Amino acid sequence: VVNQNAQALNTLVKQLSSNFGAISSVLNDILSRLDKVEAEVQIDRLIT
Amino acid sequence: VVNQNAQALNTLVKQLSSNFGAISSVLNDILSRLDKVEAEVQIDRLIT
Amino acid sequence: TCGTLSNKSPPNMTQFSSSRRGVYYPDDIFRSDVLHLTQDYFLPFNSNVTRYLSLNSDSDRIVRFDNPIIPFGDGVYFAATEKSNVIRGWIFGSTLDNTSQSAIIMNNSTHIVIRVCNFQLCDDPMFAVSRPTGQHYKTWIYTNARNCTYEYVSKSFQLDVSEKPGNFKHLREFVFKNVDGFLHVYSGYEPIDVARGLPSGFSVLKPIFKLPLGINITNFRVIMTMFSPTTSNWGAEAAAYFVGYLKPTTFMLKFDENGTITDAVDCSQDPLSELKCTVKSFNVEKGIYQTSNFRVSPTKEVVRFPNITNLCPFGEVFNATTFPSVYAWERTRISDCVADYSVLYNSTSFSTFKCYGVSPTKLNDLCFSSVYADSFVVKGDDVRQIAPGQTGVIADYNYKLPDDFTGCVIAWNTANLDATSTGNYNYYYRSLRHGKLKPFERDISNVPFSPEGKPCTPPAFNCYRPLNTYGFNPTVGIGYQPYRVVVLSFELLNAPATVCGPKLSTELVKNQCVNFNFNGLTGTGVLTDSSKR
Amino acid sequence: DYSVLYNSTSFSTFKCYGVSPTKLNDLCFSSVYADSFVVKGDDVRQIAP
Amino acid sequence: LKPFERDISNVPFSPEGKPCTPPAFNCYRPLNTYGFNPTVGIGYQPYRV
Amino acid sequence: FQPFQQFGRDVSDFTDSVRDPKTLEILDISPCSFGGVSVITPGTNTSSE
Amino acid sequence: ILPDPSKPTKRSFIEDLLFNKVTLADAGFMKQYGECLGDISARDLICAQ
């Protein structure tokens, strides 16, 4: 029971490294590199 | 119980016929027809 | 002509609290019977506001009549409290000189007047009004208004002089915002009976104007009356005004059935305010609740770029005497320099400036681990083909961009250079090949081409020279005219910055929540020393 | 084969819908129709969905 | 400029922050004419927007 | 309605009312098939009733 | 199975075996405020959380 709940949180943080089809897994990297006109398309892919 | 588990798998395979808003339900048909620059947008809709 | 002043004290800058004062409708969307939580420039609750005054002493021996130039932030909360209608209007602008346009807003004696001009403002812009019954006399506001590009005048009204002494009876509240060229004015009115300061209380300000002024508003100052019984020895009396600055904050707003705001929570104000905003509700049952951070938001920004000052050689790279032929395009490293593109604006205008994986106006504040520039000339008709996934004689046989390209394609017409007839250097493209190039592959071979896989020993049937000249005569139409192209390919690796945008750089701020930008890597957080290696 | 044309004519526009121009070289089509006309160079923008 | 802002100022511009009185080194007239001669190529021709 | 309001929406953003621009009359908009409908059947292959 | 007054723990003897026999993934809640700003090796899934 401890291991299952520990593991679930560990997979949940690791899921933040997924791109979900954005140009980057990193939010600051999109916002650094793209303008709102087209950053928001990429940010919405990470949010969803 | 048999019927429910049969029907759950049958609906799962049939759900591969959905487009999910891609140009085609058929993955080979996107990859056949579109460049990687813009197939990936379609593939991601199928993947997700 | 203008009035003049003397024996004038400096402003004292006494400060007061905007106690729940100065809420306004954040946008034009009609909402009814809903709670809306929103981020916008609002005046925070219990924010400081700076007071400015108009008071004679026992005699003209010393006077306050405060019309300093007041900075305009992302916006201003302004409240006038008065009895004798002293505060007539405002000048909004940049320099507040005839060297730049300013907006004048006057609650003039019978009309609201809005004018945008290059104004020669008076040194102390004011009305003069004959005290006992004179609704007007003269307006020492400006000498000249040279280039008036906007005017508005409201319908006729009357003002009471209300010259009686004592407590201030009127509180007039305003919010000014300047967004997308519009000056937004919100206002509200409250009956008051107070001797000093702002009274505490909730206020919502309704939209009064959207003004399509288009001015660069960064400063303002108030226009006030001075009074005389004899049209001489004008004096200042009976008013104060308070200025507060809007700051980007989250508010939760409650909209009536009629869609009026009737309560608001400043989510940053208290823990109870953060709770109310977290549970999206103005009433909260007994309990313990997890609360989302509205406590702290970054205000300072730290921008830190390598101290390389040398500008990139784009003038040299772009204004070469001749470029490569597209079949023999040349690649060059660009390094240890500041990629200021604005140096070109005086010299070359680009018909194409299309960037991939980078937005062309974030480009000014990135830094790159490496940059390569590929140079060649093509038809204006062919510049289409310099993009990922294109096809045609250039993309197939001369210059292929990769599908994963990141970089910018830059092109400009050079008929005044490359299509001169004066002994001119010829430009060539490969027209025939046995296969398509790979991305950033080159083929400078000039062996004769046969459609059959055979040697030629030309001249022979089914043998052709592979390279065609471009017809860059000066007579040809713009599709056939030469365009120079450079393709800048970037990479943004975890490696030392080699080219940077022109951003100025600022001191470190540590142990505070800040915005930061290191070599274009930008975020928000707390910076500290570290044990990391 | 469009490469037959690369020595005769360069196209100011070659814009494809539902098919990418590169993959165009290795598809087959159940049918093709060609609609032919002349317009201003200024009007060519209007021939798109 | 910010969006939909205008700047009709015509003071002499220095690349240095310090002002000038022209004619002088390191300052320039900020405004340049378009060369809308009837001879110029189509990129240089005037378009109304 | 408020004097300048043109349409109204519930908490679902369902446009439930609109001001007729000619009459200035306020119209309610209902969904085209409000409420539940359900069909009782014995099996097909025993009756089509 | 009762507590022992000769021990600092107010658990029984059996209960002290049970509490030793299960190992917590974080060894307890107190990953305190200062503790994640550590060395490069001190990166930790609990700090990532």
Ligand SMILES: *[C@@H]1O[C@H](CO)[C@@H](O[C@@H]2O[C@H](CO)[C@@H](O)[C@H](O)[C@H]2NC(C)=O)[C@H](O)[C@H]1NC(C)=O
């Ligand atoms: C790279 O070089 C090779 C060798 O010259 C090229 O291979 C030729 O390709 C065409 C079409 O595929 C054939 O008709 C030739 O017979 C090939 N040559 C040989 C020696 O086999 C190749 O096309 C060039 N380009 C790329 C991208 O590989």
Ligand SMILES: *[C@@H]1O[C@H](CO)[C@@H](O)[C@H](O)[C@H]1NC(C)=O
């Ligand atoms: C004006 O300034 C002095 C300090 O120089 C301050 O002590 C005083 O209270 C102020 N009075 C008013 C009326 O602002």
Ligand SMILES: *[C@@H]1O[C@H](CO)[C@@H](O)[C@H](O)[C@H]1NC(C)=O
């Ligand atoms: C200005 O604001 C800060 C915090 O909001 C407060 O500590 C300070 O007292 C205010 N100014 C004056 C004059 O009180």
Ligand SMILES: *[C@@H]1O[C@H](CO)[C@@H](O)[C@H](O)[C@H]1NC(C)=O
């Ligand atoms: C602005 O006003 C001053 C004051 O007289 C004057 O010297 C200056 O010439 C005016 N501006 C211009 C562009 O003339």
Ligand SMILES: *[C@@H]1O[C@H](CO)[C@@H](O)[C@H](O)[C@H]1NC(C)=O
């Ligand atoms: C300002 O008020 C005066 C006095 O009533 C009026 O005559 C004048 O028309 C107003 N301003 C303008 C621009 O009309």
Ligand SMILES: *[C@@H]1O[C@H](CO)[C@@H](O)[C@H](O)[C@H]1NC(C)=O
């Ligand atoms: C502003 O007005 C003056 C006339 O006083 C004129 O010479 C100048 O060209 C005008 N400027 C603009 C931008 O219209």
Ligand SMILES: *[C@@H]1O[C@H](CO)[C@@H](O)[C@H](O)[C@H]1NC(C)=O
């Ligand atoms: C809405 O406005 C009308 C007219 O002002 C008023 O009669 C009505 O009571 C108002 N309703 C609320 C909830 O304020």
Ligand SMILES: *[C@@H]1O[C@H](CO)[C@@H](O)[C@H](O)[C@H]1NC(C)=O
């Ligand atoms: C290119 O540079 C030379 C010397 O620096 C200069 O004479 C020439 O005017 C420049 N050409 C352009 C188009 O800027």
Ligand SMILES: *[C@@H]1O[C@H](CO)[C@@H](O)[C@H](O)[C@H]1NC(C)=O
């Ligand atoms: C800008 O170009 C003009 C010619 O149009 C020239 O006189 C001036 O010196 C140039 N200035 C800079 C900074 O390039």
Ligand SMILES: *[C@@H]1O[C@H](CO)[C@@H](O)[C@H](O)[C@H]1NC(C)=O
């Ligand atoms: C290609 O075009 C040139 C004229 O530009 C012509 O001389 C040559 O014969 C043509 N060759 C083929 C294979 O079309």
Ligand SMILES: *[C@@H]1O[C@H](CO)[C@@H](O)[C@H](O)[C@H]1NC(C)=O
């Ligand atoms: C036109 O609009 C007005 C006001 O919206 C309305 O009174 C009138 O009935 C409409 N139709 C005609 C034919 O006037």
